[model samples]
Target: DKKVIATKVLGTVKWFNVRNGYGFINRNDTKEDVFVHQTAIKKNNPRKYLRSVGDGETVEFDVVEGEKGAEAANVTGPGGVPVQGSKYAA
Candidate 1:
């Protein structure tokens, strides 16, 4: 099997529309906006929902090549834990 390794990066939540379930993440230093979908934020988990990462919030995540270009996935706090309020309330 081909090893699908994701590129790691550091960024901040540039803008997000909770209603739209999509947003852009600003790359650290370079200030590039990477597209992020709610699907990717809560990816790999069925019991979780899209986490609310406010604008300017910093995060570390993996980037996967998409149809458009490089995008964020498995978004989490810089320290690797899920963002606050990432999990759906039980």
Candidate 2:
């Protein structure tokens, strides 16, 4: 599968309407907002499961093209395990 390495969310969860189960993720690379749906969340109870990921939290994720602009996938919290940089270093 094609892959694109992109910065992750390093900002706040923004607004998460529990009723809607969807919210926006602010990336550190750019001020652009990324739409994240509950289904996009890797785990259940994403809010609680990803409690460590809050406003100003830095994260690394992959950018996937959505119907709109871009969406964050495989979101990892600051406290989450760190990933080594690519050996090729693009």
Candidate 3:
């Protein structure tokens, strides 16, 4: 048997409920979804309080295996920039 691993993969924001502070991300490499927590989303601007990514937004992140699901970490906008916000107010 062999082991497989993935790192810092590109993906798109499927949808994120800002108020809920959690969302799923669609992988660019393949058709798959990963669970993203607000805590994992990088903070680009110190001024912003809640960390989030808007729907249809492009992002880069690392997928980690977890009990609940394929959790995503270090989430950021393209080029490691701060993830943009959704139109809805949180």
Candidate 4:
């Protein structure tokens, strides 16, 4: 049996597209940047359709090997809270 281990990682959002719903995450623990999909964001409210991350927002997530490469999973605000929407709207 083969399974990937889940290691929580902290990072900052380099950039994001609210309409596109995807972005790159800059790791605090590593130089390798991570790709983040809107689906990976953990919503604080279950009623919410999806949660989005903002540029420069601090986040916590799990790194995983995606089809293309390393990406973020279970992304959330620091301490597992809902990610705050981008302050500067694009």
Task: List per-prediction Cα lDDT, in the order shown.
Answer: 0.64, 0.52, 0.75, 0.73
Task: After superposing candidate 2 on the true structure, give the runs of residues whose Cα lies further than 4 Å from its correct spot.
Answer: 1-9, 43-60, 81-90
Provide the global lDDT of candidate 4 against the true structure: 0.73
Query: Where is model 3 more than 4 Å wrong at Cα?
Result: 1-5, 44-47
Q: How many clashing pairs per prediction, in order?
A: 0, 1, 0, 0
TM-score, one value per model: 0.69, 0.57, 0.82, 0.78
How many steric clashes does model 4 contain? Answer: 0
**Candidate numbers, best lDDT first, in rank order:** 3, 4, 1, 2
- Candidate 2 global TM-score: 0.57
Instruction: Compose the digit string of candidate 1's lDDT tens values, residues 1-90.
Output: 423235557788776667666778888856777778766665222344545555677777776656676678777776565654232222
Q: For candidate 2, write residues 1-90 as lDDT tens digits.
A: 644436444544555554444567776567778876645544232325332233343555557777677876766545554322112211
Candidate 2 lDDT score at position 78 = 53
Report how far residue 73 has shifted in candidate 4, in Å.
0.7
Better of 2 and 3 by lDDT: 3
